[PDB]
Amino acid sequence: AAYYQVVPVTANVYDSDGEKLSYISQGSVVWLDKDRKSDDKRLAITISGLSGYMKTEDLQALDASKDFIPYYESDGHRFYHYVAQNASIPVASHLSDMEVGKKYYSADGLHFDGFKLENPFLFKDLTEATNYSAEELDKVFSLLNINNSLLENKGATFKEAEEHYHINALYLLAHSALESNWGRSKIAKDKNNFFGITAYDTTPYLSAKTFDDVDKGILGATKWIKENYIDRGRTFLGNKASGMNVEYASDPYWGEKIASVMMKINEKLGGKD
Ligand SMILES: [Ca+2]
């Protein structure tokens, strides 16, 4: 088969030495890499920029004529990644080289046969501050019709987190937007945890960290990200090959999803970043 689906809750991706490089989520589709040797026990595969090996035990072959395979498609305005049959995210602007309504296939979401994507937020150094002020970040809730969010009017706590910990506030807003549904998840409301901290794939809600209030959740999650990711040399969102996505989340498109939110906010606030 050309495509394989991850069967267990998560599965490891290994190098040729058998060392763990990362892990990916149940349902993830990986591409068979025909330039490298596969055997009975391990397949050479690619996923979200990472070229390695997976145990055949963890995979199920798909048939692309009847099973969903992730793909990218232009509407003539934005290029979308279909990350699941019924969910698309906008990743870039339409390039004149894209045929409208044609499905395109890419292992990194950057290199395609007939064009290449800049996804600048995906690789943007997150220690650089946003050019958006507290008031500009706060205007995004109306501009995107975000209702009943615990993060409404917290632009000032985000810019404080950015001032004190040197982490990009537009990135902190986008990450909390994705992980907690803009501060509307049960974890968001119960534990002021907006970033999915220690919310492990095996038991996400049980292992989720508790913060005392919304402001301490923003500042406390920022301190955690700084100490566990930024300070250990994970300084951009990235994918399964590099950046925070190697270890932060099983979802191979976690970084792409956060970049997509940064892109949408940036566009609605006037393009200052
Ligand atoms: Ca090695």
Swiss-Prot record:
Biological process terms in GO annotation: cell wall organization
Top-rank lineage group of the source organism: Bacteria
UniProt keyword Hydrolase present: yes
Gene Ontology CC terms: extracellular region
Subcellular locations according to the entry: Secreted
GO molecular function: amidase activity; mannosyl-glycoprotein endo-beta-N-acetylglucosaminidase activity
Keyword set, alphabetical order: Cell wall biogenesis/degradation, Hydrolase, Repeat, Secreted, Signal
Magnesium among keywords: no
Function: Plays an important role in cell wall degradation and cell separation.
Entry's family note: Belongs to the glycosyl hydrolase 73 family.
Protein name in UniProt: Putative endo-beta-N-acetylglucosaminidase
Organism: Streptococcus pneumoniae serotype 4 (strain ATCC BAA-334 / TIGR4)
Highest classification ranks of the organism: Bacteria, Bacillati, Bacillota, Bacilli, Lactobacillales
Covered range of the whole protein: 386 to 658 of 658
